[PDB]
Every structure is written in C-alpha cells, then in structure tokens.
Design a protein around this ligand. Sequence first.
Ligand code: HEM
Ligand SMILES: O=C(CCCCn1ccnc1)N[C@@H](Cc1ccccc1)C(=O)O
Length: 454
Amino acid sequence: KEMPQPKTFGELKNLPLLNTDKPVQALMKIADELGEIFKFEAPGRVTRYLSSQRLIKEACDESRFDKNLSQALKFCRDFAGDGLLTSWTHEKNWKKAHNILLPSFSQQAMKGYHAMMVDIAVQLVQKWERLNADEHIEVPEDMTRLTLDTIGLCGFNYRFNSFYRDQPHPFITSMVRALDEAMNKLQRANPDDPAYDENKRQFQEDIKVMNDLVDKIIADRKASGEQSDDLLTHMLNGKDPETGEPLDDENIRYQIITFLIAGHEVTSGLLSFALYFLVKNPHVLQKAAEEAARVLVDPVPSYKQVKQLKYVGMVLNEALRLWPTAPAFSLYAKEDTVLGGEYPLEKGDELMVLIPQLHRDKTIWGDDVEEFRPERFENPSAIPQHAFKPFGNGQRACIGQQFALHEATLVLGMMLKHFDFEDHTNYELDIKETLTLKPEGFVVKAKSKKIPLL
Ligand code: HEM
Ligand SMILES: O=C(CCCCn1ccnc1)N[C@@H](Cc1ccccc1)C(=O)O
C-alpha cells in the first residue's frame, strides 16, 4: 500500500503543519482524515505517524523496533544529556542507569517516598482549605506546584517551596524556558542565521543555571555524607550489577534534571485532566468521592490505603486514555521489516506513535471513545495488547510510572475526601501544548467538607 500524506508546502514538505500552537491536536486531525498511518516529511526528515492498535502492536515489538530520539528529545538532550529519557538504548549510560534506578522506582520503593509525597499533598490541601469564600483554584498551576515539589523532595531532598511563591524557583524558570526553546526550535530552517543569536545565548544561560544548582546539590550531598530516602542517595551509592560501576557525577546530574523535566509536567497534566473529567462527569466524581471517603479513614493516607483507591486509579487511567500527557514516542526499525503486511520498512526507518489517537481506536474501545468511563479499566486482561500506551513501551517505558500513579492517586484521593468541587465557569477545554499537554485556564471552586488533617 501507498501510505497517505497530508498537504505539502513545496520544498518545506509537511513542516509548516507543525508551525501551530497545538501541533499534537493538528496531527490528531490529520489522523482523523488520513487514517491509521501517514507519512510526514520535512527537510532532512521522514517519519510515519501511527494511530491504530493494529499497527502500533507491531511497532511495540522490541525485536523489530527500538526507541528513536524524536527531534524534540534530541533538542532536550542539550540539557538532559544522556539521562534515561534522552539516551539511546545502545549508550552505555542508558543500561547502567536503568539497572541502577529500577529498584528506586519500584512499587516497593514507593513505600519509602510516601511520607514525602504526603508532605506536599498536605500543603496542597491546606492551601485550598485556606481560600476565602468565593476565591477559586487555578488547577494546572497548583498541580504543577505539587508535582515539582514532590519530585524535588523525593528526588534529592530539596524544597522548591512552590506553595510559598507566585514566581517559581529560579531553576524552574530556567527549566521551563529551556523546554520552551527546545520545542520552538522545531521550525527553524537556518539555525545559524545570526537572527537567533539571542535565543542561542539565552538557551546556554538556562542550561548553566540548571547545571550549577544540580551540581551544587550533588557536591553538597557528598560533602555532608548524609543518607536520605531520595533518589540522589540511591545514585551516589548504587552499583550497576552488570558492569559493577556506579554513575558518575555528571550522569547523576543529568538524571536529576531528567526527573524534573520528565515527570513534573506529565504528572501535573494528568491530575488536571483527571479533575476536569471528574467535574464534567458528576456521577463519576460521586463514585470516586465515595471511594475516597470509604478508604481514607485516617487523618493522613497510608501507603496501603492509596493502593486501595481502585476506582481513583481507574479514573486516572481513563484520563490518560483521553489525554495522555506525554503525547508521543518514536521508534526506528532495527532491520528491514513489513508493518501490518502492507507497509515495507527499511532498516532505520522511523515511526511516531500518536498516543491520543491510538486511545481513540474505535475497534478497541467502541463507538463511545470520547466518553469518560473509568469502568473501561476494571480488568487489564480485557484490554488488547498495546492498546493503552500512556507510559511508552518495553524496556524504554516510563521508569516513573509507579511514582506518577502513586502521587496522582494519593493527591486525587485527598482532594476528593476533603472538598466538593464546582465547575463555576463551565470551563471550555483548551489544551495547551508544550512538550506535554495540559488544560489551560482550568479553574474550579472547592468547598471544604471540614474534615481535619490532624
Ligand atoms: C502521567 C505521568 C507520566 C507519563 C504519562 C509519562 C510518560 C512517559 C513516556 C510515554 C515515556 C516513554 C518516552 C519515549 O519512549 O520516548 C516515558 C519515559 C520516561 N519517564 Fe515518564 N511519564 C510520566 C511520569 C514520569 C515521572 C514522574 C518520572 C520521574 C519522576 C518520569 C521519568 C521518565 C524517564 C526517566 C523516562 C525514560 C525511561 C527510559 O527510557 O529508561 N516519568 N515517560
Ligand atoms: O514526540 C514528541 C515529543 C514528546 C515527548 C513526550 N514526553 C513528555 C515527557 N516525557 C515524554 N512530539 C510530537 C508532537 C509535536 C510535534 C511538534 C511540536 C510539538 C509536539 C512529535 O514530534 O511529533
């Protein structure tokens, strides 16, 4: 089969199609028009966007396809280095850091992070308890305060103290600005044109800000000798069972930067979309709130109680189905191969997995794919293979999946226990796009149930 291709712009091919505020949503509309696979060309680039479970289940065959660095991840590598997210599978530091960090991200390690997650979650609840009568909540903003502070505390015992600020910590300002520059660079045809000399100069300044703080944090920890229950301690002490080597200080820095750029935005986006769908579906909200009240019987949630928030977990998965906050990942063919019995690929050919469109495959989910129904996730065995991929695939899947879902389940559970929520503006979903997706301008009012935290 000849695969379809969206409209072209002469020598720029398809590139101008991504010169828009909402490129993922533009790609979703193209998939609606062209189907499960389309070619996408830019100067010096060819890829193929996949949208059907039928083809993506083959793309997830690790014997045939390996992780590719998208252009987006290639530009993030300028500050995330050879951290886990922006490393090639064949780089020595990927397998080393992977082996060392897996035990630090397990479901069992969440038991040790739980107290620190509760610390920040309680700060969120207390902020909302302290709002005056007809004040409102800026949801994505507060969720980002929470996830940034949680990763900072669990990552390297550092308090960004985001709930004490209107202006973010200087590291966060530089990180956000570096991510924005990485995403903006996806359109420039003459990078060395002197017109962008200021962007380049600003980009380097933000990189130095992040490195200096993280390098200082590492140096301070080695100088104090203190042992915490954070990822930094595990990385200073861990040894790769395979090579027997530890991570060096440079790679440890890249991992810390990666944890912050990799998990803060996708996780706050998940919480924001989850709360959005809950207030738009009051029957679902009531069911989730009933579970929270039944399970969270103590002033502070325990680790075990979070595991019992089954329906809250399904709410989070259904929010990830409709709006997976990490919207795509990239693959390359390890050898010549045929995709779906119709599209021959040569060794090295690239694929993009368009996750929000995969999750709308009506052959998998039925005709009501746009409806928010957490009950779809009652039984993981009922879900066909590779139909649900918000955390990527295989050995290159999200190492932070357990962390993100424990944090989100804890916080969402506490939110549902302590407040009733009002969609007081009848908010119209508007999805802002960066590296990730989030509902911009989403606001609610939260009326306290007056349940103490002591
Ligand atoms: C809802 C929350 C999250 C979502 C949807 C998500 C999504 C993803 C996806 C799709 C990938 C695969 C990327 C690719 O193949 O190019 C990935 C990888 C990764 N994620 Fe997440 N993530 C989340 C939270 C987190 C958190 C909280 C952390 C750290 C605290 C984290 C750290 C990482 C790392 C290090 C990788 C690279 C793993 C490797 O290749 O070895 N993520 N994530
Ligand atoms: O593929 C990625 C990078 C996604 C990173 C996912 N992620 C987030 C955190 N961890 C992982 N963008 C997609 C979509 C896109 C296209 C143009 C401009 C912006 C976005 C693409 O290039 O087609």
